[PDB]
Amino acid sequence: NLAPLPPHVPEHLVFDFDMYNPSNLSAGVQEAWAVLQESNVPDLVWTRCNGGHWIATRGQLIREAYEDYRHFSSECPFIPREAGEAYDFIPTSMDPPEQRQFRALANQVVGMPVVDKLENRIQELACSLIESLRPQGQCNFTEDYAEPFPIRIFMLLAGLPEEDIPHLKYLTDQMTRPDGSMTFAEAKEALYDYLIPIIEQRRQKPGTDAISIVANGQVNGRPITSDEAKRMCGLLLVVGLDTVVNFLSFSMEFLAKSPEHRQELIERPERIPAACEELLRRFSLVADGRILTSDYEFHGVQLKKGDQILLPQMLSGLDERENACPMHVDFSRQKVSHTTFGHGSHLCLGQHLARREIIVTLKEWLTRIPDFSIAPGAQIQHKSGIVSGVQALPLVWDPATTKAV
């Protein structure tokens, strides 16, 4: 359904892109979004889909808008508007200066220092999961590895039982790729219904888990409030259950379809880190945005106070203006440019944990299962939203070609 065109939006800037069900989704989600970068498409367009909103299509504008928080506010970061209005997670729903004090505490529970403490656990789980699958000669990658690996590690640090995964995963997914059964607001309240008692429980009897640290934390010298802690932990759950999980599947789908690249990493393991960065660019998957704090002329386009603008983190690296032959994957690419982990004051705090999980996966999987492919006749389906993903990824391989170690 298309919303009536606002009086200030000129017809020549209309491009009805649906971020939750893009026209060319069958060609791959990144490819579907890339249509926004075709020759005849303006740098900034307006779509009448999902209530109506602007979409910056080039890395230059995306980066600029993310840096200018005075005009582009995070107060309402999601499309549709009802979702952005209900969205109140900390620190993502705040703009500087207020945002910074909470960011410092968040970095404390998901930052590099935390990764170091989880290193052995992360390594051990990846190897354990892969070894268990190796002899089967097949797997449903999304549910057999992409989900359990990142999620179990997260539940470990958050001190939450693994049996709670199904429910929490469902809720998080409704906030990024809603199936229609729940509005963002309904999913949020369900998430908070789960968290509130745990936070109070851990404020009374503090543990060493991430929820306890946040719950009993301080924000620039003063005690964090119960609601602030709740809004912070809400973000942690979403990010721990619906980010790396999706990216791993895009990366493995690609490797399953390209023996050449698998071979390159097998022969030269030292290239894994660089490969991780090139895959992060090519298979970027996030797209959220901002709301205009006032009327503002941006790159020749008149934006009105309250207008929502989608700033696809995914598009910057796919922009041929930033990377030549953007759809081509080259692990030796000289200057890999992207905004996969965001840009500006809200730059991803968990990117170190994400990269570690990606690199460990690449290394340990290729060491045990060097040769694999997409299951016979399988047609991989992608899903689009605030965070895009892969519906299912059935893989097959000959056990005789694997190495247990």
**Binding region:** 348
What residues between 310 and 349 interact with ligand CAM by CB under 6 A?
A: none
Catalytic residues: 177, 242-243, 348-350
- In degrees rounded to 5, what are phi and psi of residue 233? -65, -30
Q: Which does 30 bind (CB under 5 to 8 A by kind): ligand CAM, K ion, ligand HEM, none?
A: none
Cβ pair 248, 185 in contact under 8 A: no
- CA pair distance 70, 84, nearest whole angstrom: 18
Q: CB under 6 A: which stretch of 32-40, 65-73, 203-211, 237-245 binds ligand CAM?
A: 237-245
By CB under 6 A, the residues from 158 to 177 that bind ligand CAM are 176
Report 260-289 residues binding ligand CAM (CB under 6 A): 286, 288
Residue 87 near K ion by CB under 5 A: yes
Q: Does 278 bind ligand HEM (CB under 6 A)?
A: no
Q: For residue 163, give every residue at least 6 positions away whose Cβ sits within 8 Å of its Cβ, in sequence order, or none.
A: none
**Minimum gap (Å) between residue 30 Cβ and ligand HEM:** 13
Residue whose CB is less far from ligand CAM, 34 or 238: 238
- The pair phi, psi for residue 21, each rounded to 5°, is -160, 65
In the complex, least distance from residue 4 CB atom to ligand HEM, rounded to whole angstroms: 28
225 contacts: CB under 8 Å, gap ≥ 6: none
Residues in contact with ligand HEM, shown as a per-residue x/- string from 42 to 81 under the rule CB under 6 A: --------------------------------x--x----
For residue 62, the partner it binds in ligand CAM, K ion, ligand HEM, none, with Cβ less than 5 to 8 A by kind, is none
Q: Does 238 bind ligand CAM (CB under 6 A)?
A: yes
Which of ligand CAM, ligand HEM, K ion, none does residue 388 bind to, with CB < 5 to 8 Å depending on kind?
none
- Positions 75 through 114 that interact with ligand HEM (CB under 6 A): 77, 91-92, 103, 106, 110
Establish if 255 lies at the interface with ligand CAM (CB under 6 A). no
Select from 188-196, 241-249, 317-325, 390-398 the region that touches ligand HEM (CB under 6 A). 241-249
Residue 362 interacts with which of ligand CAM, ligand HEM, K ion, none, CB < 5 to 8 Å by class: none
Among 67-75, 207-215, 238-246, 266-274, the segment contacting ligand CAM (CB under 6 A) = 238-246
Q: Does 341 bind ligand HEM (CB under 6 A)?
A: yes
Evaluate the omega torsion of the peptide bond into residue 326 and state whether it is cis, within 30 degrees of 0: no
Of residues 159 and 259, the one with the C-beta less far from ligand HEM: 159
Cβ-closest residue to ligand HEM? 350
- Report the interface residues with ligand CAM, using CB under 6 A: 89, 92, 176, 238-239, 243, 286, 288, 386-387
- Report the interface residues with K ion, using CB under 5 A: 76, 87
